Amino acid sequence: ECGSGNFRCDNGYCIPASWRCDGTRDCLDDTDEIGCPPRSCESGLFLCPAEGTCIPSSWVCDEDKDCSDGADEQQNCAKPTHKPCTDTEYKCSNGNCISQHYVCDNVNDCGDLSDETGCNLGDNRTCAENICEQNCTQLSSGGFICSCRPGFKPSTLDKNSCQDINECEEFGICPQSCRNSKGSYECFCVDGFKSMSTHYGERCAADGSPPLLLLPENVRIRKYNTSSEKFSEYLEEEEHIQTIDYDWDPEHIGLSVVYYTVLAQGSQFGAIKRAYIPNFESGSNNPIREVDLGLKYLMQPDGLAVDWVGRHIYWSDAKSQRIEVATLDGRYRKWLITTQLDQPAAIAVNPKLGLMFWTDQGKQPKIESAWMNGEHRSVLVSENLGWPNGLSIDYLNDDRVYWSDSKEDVIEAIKYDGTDRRLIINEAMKPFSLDIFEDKLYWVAKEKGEVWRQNKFGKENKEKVLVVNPWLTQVRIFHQLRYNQSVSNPCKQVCSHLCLLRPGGYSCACPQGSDFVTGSTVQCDAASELPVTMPPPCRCMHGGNCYFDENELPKCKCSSGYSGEYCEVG
Amino acid sequence: ECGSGNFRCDNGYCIPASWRCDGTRDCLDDTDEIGCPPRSCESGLFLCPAEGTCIPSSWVCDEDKDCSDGADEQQNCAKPTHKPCTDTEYKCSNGNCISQHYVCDNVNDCGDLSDETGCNLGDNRTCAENICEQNCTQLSSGGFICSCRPGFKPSTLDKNSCQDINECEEFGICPQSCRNSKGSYECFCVDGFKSMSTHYGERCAADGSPPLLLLPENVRIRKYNTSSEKFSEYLEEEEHIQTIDYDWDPEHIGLSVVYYTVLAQGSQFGAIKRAYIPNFESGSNNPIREVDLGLKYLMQPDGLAVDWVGRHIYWSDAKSQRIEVATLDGRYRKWLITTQLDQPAAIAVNPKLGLMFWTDQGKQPKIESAWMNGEHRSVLVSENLGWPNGLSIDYLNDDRVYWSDSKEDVIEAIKYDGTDRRLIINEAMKPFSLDIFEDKLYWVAKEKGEVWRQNKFGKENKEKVLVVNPWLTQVRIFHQLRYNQSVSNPCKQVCSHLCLLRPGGYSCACPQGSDFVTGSTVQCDAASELPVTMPPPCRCMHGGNCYFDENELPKCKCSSGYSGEYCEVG
Ligand SMILES: *[C@@H]1O[C@H](CO)[C@@H](O)[C@H](O[C@@H]2O[C@H](CO)[C@@H](O[C@@H]3O[C@H](CO[C@H]4O[C@H](CO)[C@@H](O)[C@H](O)[C@@H]4O)[C@@H](O)[C@H](O[C@H]4O[C@H](CO)[C@@H](O)[C@H](O)[C@@H]4O)[C@@H]3O)[C@H](O)[C@H]2NC(C)=O)[C@H]1NC(C)=O
Ligand SMILES: *[C@@H]1O[C@H](CO)[C@@H](O[C@@H]2O[C@H](CO)[C@@H](O[C@@H]3O[C@H](CO[C@H]4O[C@H](CO)[C@@H](O)[C@H](O)[C@@H]4O)[C@@H](O)[C@H](O[C@H]4O[C@H](CO)[C@@H](O)[C@H](O)[C@@H]4O)[C@@H]3O)[C@H](O)[C@H]2NC(C)=O)[C@H](O)[C@H]1NC(C)=O
Ligand SMILES: *[C@@H]1O[C@H](CO)[C@@H](O[C@@H]2O[C@H](CO)[C@@H](O)[C@H](O[C@@H]3O[C@H](CO)[C@@H](O)[C@H](O)[C@@H]3O)[C@H]2NC(C)=O)[C@H](O)[C@H]1NC(C)=O
Ligand SMILES: *[C@@H]1O[C@H](CO)[C@@H](O[C@@H]2O[C@H](CO)[C@@H](O[C@@H]3O[C@H](CO)[C@@H](O)[C@H](O)[C@@H]3O)[C@H](O)[C@H]2NC(C)=O)[C@H](O)[C@H]1NC(C)=O
């Protein structure tokens, strides 16, 4: 038995007498709370055991279930330099010294064959009389042989004359522009850029505002000021957006225009839409109004491109298998490519050269190019390809075009004529889109939604930029130097409806269905249509709000720290 | 023919002769530029057409291809009232005002089986003699026809006596409570809630700061202010987050603690991690430091729940097919349910009642309840279920439990004992998780990535809250009233290691792989481990920046307008 101050629970466990009937089941057999004193409340009041309340006793045995359990009824009524060597050896073009008896023995001994790069003989001959431009080398047998200083090599048709190597013959020599010199070279930066030299090597750097990355996410377009590593709101409350492209400040406003497609869902067709994007840090939650261009019968716009010098918008519909061109306001639709297309994935245009490029991801993947007016169609790659999701053009390096591939998991480039095919990125974890800017190749891993960065030449290591939802569909660099804004428009106001580009000059065209009248080739039978302008957007600087007056003209206020009509002055 | 000053294209098109040699291929043919004399540069300085530059003749024909073409080396040197009854009508059951002649003709004319009430024949009677309780009508040949006064129903035996209704029983009568009274009812808001009336009717507004939403994605966890509509950063850079739960403000320091499970990635085990959350508004100014509990052999913790009273954490694992418990610092792991489990998906705990609930979404789905100590396991719902991926408990409405399906995509509610199953929400677009707060019920449509909302009783209609991502795995409401903080811990420090809870009391238990000391039920032969303390948090408020010194303690770079060790003084 337990002590006087302890209570024997039924199982034998001794419980301190204080814990008995304290309101908690304190031992396994639950007998520390069994046989507790009844709940006395007061005279004249019936306590229902299920609540603990004390209802009047006049409510007992009246056939009304007054308490939750009704006890009133049922209960009561119940690296060193190149090593020198003696004259019995020779310093080859390669960084080594090889014995002179291995020279003019007619067997390669220092890799570059420099030991027998044109050995010469002659009874009248001496090495140091006149044989080649820079240096010759003599051996005691009477033979003699020449070599050329770095940056030079003996001529192929005459092994006694030094000729310069054009260092631009190699892909990865300089950023931007390689320029050849006799025995040397230079890597001067193009206008707008600046020279810089970083840990991995020389680097050409842009100017002005830092680049932005525009990221469509099937519901929103989100900005990323890459030098601040912060996001900004921009467009929202949209659905099934698939690809975007922009035109840089067409009206000299400080407000570029972003063109984005919308996929068709169910029985509602898709459309291409346009809206202003602030070139200014005003990434605040300012109102953004999109405008539909009104292009009908769109079922899957998969690729989109903007000709900023011709003021045309090019796109391709994978389901309908057409590549179409129209003005930026959606007028004068025109079918360019209508045959031999199974699934046109993405397109890009080069108005400087008048060439447009596109990819096919259907049964027989291929990459094709043609004139921007639809003529001179040709192929570029037809082997070792699958699902070429997208391509972009590096206008600053001989207009070489890179493209992505999510079946070979590769990124590789080619010149605009189809030559110089090189592999750039391997193991790119399903790249779905890409863009090239200032050497940095950006691409999107669709299976996991990361933005990845590497040098466009592919001679560095990968870097992860940021991670977003798998709704990410494309990466696009939003910067002034992305497109040469100063490219002159060759059109001479001769065409009536459309003035497409071709390599040099231009070419007139009619809207789809209408033809030229009597072979005029400038005048079409279709009636001309008025241009479509966009409503004035909010241009407020330094993070001001935006309102609409009684005239619904967007006028906007801000903090008085900055003043002006548009919050532009300090 | 063409004019004198107009050049002729060979197709019959006449164009101004100024376009000759202007630079662009104007004609449809190329003759507009073909035949143009090239620009003259200088004598003795050859202009290479491939670049547009002029080069001295000494550099020319040196076998160095100075220009890209290299031709310099080859060719250069070649109701108001609801129709109330008068004396001429009959009330029938509760207002069916047809003419009076339905009185006790022994025919069910009213349609409702209340046309004849009383109706005991005999001409010499009036119930004013106290034959029926209240509100008779005079029977023409039987004295009394006695329908019950409003708020009452007739008893089976002695139908002349009317039983009071129980209006608290009917589902969805008041948002929070009820008080059955004599022929009437009164309903009120429980402690912590303020009475308000919307355009529809009653609302019990929770006091204090407005509720938040916590959205865990595979990469990050995002806060949301249901009243301000602005997001917040919280935890970032993490990977493979599945489900979360929190413990409100344990130390009164002003910071709750958020627990979240991390899946197994590749061939590497997952973990359960915890971190502070600022109850006060803050973001990007306090770095968030997560810590690991240290639970090995963990693959897929789809279910996590925090018992705020006993200070235990309950989680399930789909791969191990078992449910385990441990302290909030990862000590003393113990298995609770180990048999007849296919895929334990979600879990919830009710310390006040002493019951914890889990859902199984295997080949034979079921929803079960058991004591926290692990006994009295039973099946609540097995009929008509498919993939019950979610689970929530409404601690206010008689501890009712809700769950979300994914095959039948309904949301249902049932009492904790398993009776009165109701289908609260239909066609819920495959909900994945639940959380019931105040008046409304929240759930996540997984594929669409949208957070939705409805009145928790199923009345009215749905409403989109916000859209995140296809990565959204849960929604959990964050507020101090979500878990009643004033529930007293029944444990009395007599148990070493785990002190589990049960209906009405506690129970001591030993960690896994160890037993009690023989002859004892409060002590085990295993050792004990010291509690694992939290690292000090960044408590900065109002935008103050946290900072780490040589001591690595968090301190504040407090913002303007506020003073104090962090920012606590206005
Ligand atoms: C992305 O993030 C990066 C890093 O955070 C940002 O740098 C970048 O844009 C930055 O945006 C701010 C605000 O618009 C710019 O501030 C302005 O800079 C002007 C020029 O500053 C000069 O000197 C700095 C020295 O470091 C040099 O870096 C700059 O390149 C430049 O040579 C500055 O003059 C200007 O104030 C003038 O204009 C006001 C207009 O009202 C007047 O009131 C005021 O009196 C004065 O005359 C302002 O401070 C910032 O320059 C810019 N980036 C940089 C550093 O150049 C972010 N981009 C986006 C899209 O957000
Ligand atoms: C989620 O969204 C809600 C609503 O926006 C936020 O709630 C706000 O929280 C801030 C910070 O706590 C509140 O700001 C402070 O309010 C105090 C008074 O509160 C009452 O009056 C305000 C008037 O604006 C009401 O909005 C509020 O609801 C109460 O009725 C002020 O006294 C504070 O300033 C004064 O005290 C400080 C003390 O240091 C001094 O320094 C100041 O000089 C001054 O004397 C301050 O203004 C704000 O009021 C809250 N608004 C509402 C509507 O709730 C949540 O903060 C947000 N997220 C969460 C949960 O953090
Ligand atoms: C973006 O495009 C512009 C053209 O809008 C490029 O500027 C012109 O580029 C051409 C071809 O490289 C140069 O010849 C131009 O320089 C001058 O050209 C005239 C003949 O028109 C010569 O007589 C001059 O000696 C001089 O060479 C150059 N300038 C213009 C406005 O015509 C520009 O290079 C390009 N920039 C980038 C960043 O791509
Ligand atoms: C959160 O839990 C606490 C309990 O931990 C709840 O407080 C409780 O409120 C009820 C009703 O006011 C109290 O019941 C009353 O008890 C007294 C005797 O103490 C009795 O005379 C009354 O007739 C009535 O039964 C209860 O004592 C009280 N508990 C404590 C310790 O304060 C609180 O309501 C809960 N909140 C929510 C929203 O669930």
Ligand SMILES: *[C@@H]1O[C@H](CO)[C@@H](O)[C@H](O)[C@H]1NC(C)=O
């Ligand atoms: C070879 O050419 C170099 C210049 O690179 C010159 O300086 C050196 O003297 C030459 N060597 C001989 C052996 O002529």
Ligand SMILES: *[C@@H]1O[C@H](CO)[C@@H](O)[C@H](O)[C@H]1NC(C)=O
């Ligand atoms: C009978 O019911 C009416 C309301 O319909 C009420 O006004 C009247 O007082 C009741 N009569 C009695 C006797 O209770």
Ligand SMILES: [Ca+2]
């Ligand atoms: Ca007790």
Ligand SMILES: [Ca+2]
């Ligand atoms: Ca009663």
Ligand SMILES: [Ca+2]
């Ligand atoms: Ca040799």
Ligand SMILES: [Ca+2]
């Ligand atoms: Ca050279």
Ligand SMILES: [Ca+2]
């Ligand atoms: Ca011309």
Ligand SMILES: [Ca+2]
């Ligand atoms: Ca030459």
Ligand SMILES: [Ca+2]
């Ligand atoms: Ca009748």
Ligand SMILES: [Ca+2]
């Ligand atoms: Ca009642």
